UniProtKB/Swiss-Prot annotation:
Residues carrying N6-acetyllysine: K157
Complex formation: DNA-PK is a heterotrimer of PRKDC and the Ku dimer (composed of XRCC6/Ku70 and XRCC5/Ku86). Formation of this complex may be promoted by interaction with ILF3. Component of the core long-range non-homologous end joining (NHEJ) complex (also named DNA-PK complex) composed of PRKDC, LIG4, XRCC4, XRCC6/Ku70, XRCC5/Ku86 and NHEJ1/XLF. Additional component of the NHEJ complex includes PAXX. Following autophosphorylation, PRKDC dissociates from DNA. Interacts with DNA-PKcs-interacting protein (KIP) with the region upstream the kinase domain.
Protein name: DNA-dependent protein kinase catalytic subunit
Record PTM: Autophosphorylated at two clusters, the T2609 cluster and the S2056 cluster. Autophosphorylation induces a conformational change that leads to remodeling of the DNA-PK complex, requisite for efficient end processing and DNA repair. S-nitrosylated by GAPDH.
Full-sequence portion shown in this chain: 2090 to 2307 of 4128
Function recorded in the entry: Serine/threonine-protein kinase that acts as a molecular sensor for DNA damage. Involved in DNA non-homologous end joining (NHEJ) required for double-strand break (DSB) repair and V(D)J recombination. Must be bound to DNA to express its catalytic properties. Promotes processing of hairpin DNA structures in V(D)J recombination by activation of the hairpin endonuclease artemis (DCLRE1C). Recruited by XRCC5 and XRCC6 to DNA ends and is required to (1) protect and align broken ends of DNA, thereby preventing their degradation, (2) and sequester the DSB for repair by NHEJ.
Length: 205
């Protein structure tokens, strides 16, 4: 809870009230954020400020998302996954008002964050884990454009070593949640085998 910057939020609110690029000392911030070469502390400061004041620069999300998007990628000290979930929720606070489809880079970074989340979608508390579950639910039900189901590693995270343990069921749950949308059940070019990829399902059942 690094908090020594509330007057920055106050002045941002005042500038919004006292006053499609809007360089109200803003494009300077966008440039200093777009480069992924800066100590992570400054990234944390700007992340807190945008998390507090996204509503000010609402008619600029179509350019705001991409530097934030690459900031989310490779995000490596007060708990990294915390700020990860808040920034992804804030960047998903809109659905059609801004979307990651204009450049190949946005789909690339969307795939990267997908990989990170699905390799890290678990918590023993089973409620914040469920919280992650509706996070994936919301993102898959909103975007459907930059999304690219891997079908390779998800195979073994639902299948596993075939134990009696209740470990891989998270994979089955995430498959069901993402398949609540109209996504294809299985891409033959993905998952390599694409045939016994469901045999693992029947063994798990």
């Amino acid at each position: 809870r690094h908090e020594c910057m509330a007057p920055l939020t106050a002045l941002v609110k005042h500038m919004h009230r006292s006053l499609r690029d809007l360089p109200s000392w803003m494009k300077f911030l966008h440039g200093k954020l777009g480069n992924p070469i800066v100590p992570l502390n400054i990234r944390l400061f700007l992340a807190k400020l945008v998390i507090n004041t996204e509503e000010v620069f609402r008619p600029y999300a179509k350019h705001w998302l991409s530097p934030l998007l690459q900031l989310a990628a490779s995000e490596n000290g007060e708990g990294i996954h915390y700020m990860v979930v808040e920034i992804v929720a804030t960047i998903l606070s809109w659905t059609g008002l801004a979307t990651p489809t204009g450049v190949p880079k946005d789909e690339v970074l969307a795939n990267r964050l997908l990989n990170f989340l699905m390799k890290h979608v678990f918590h023993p508390k089973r409620a914040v884990f469920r919280h992650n579950l509706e996070i994936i639910k919301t993102l898959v039900e909103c975007w459907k454009d930059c999304l690219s189901i891997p079908y390779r590693l998800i195979f073994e995270k639902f299948s596993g070593k075939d134990p009696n343990s209740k470990d891989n069921s998270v994979g089955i749950q995430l498959l069901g949640i993402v398949m609540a949308n109209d996504l294809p059940p299985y891409d033959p070019q993905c998952g390599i085998q694409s045939s016994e990829y469901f045999q693992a399902l029947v063994n798990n059942m």
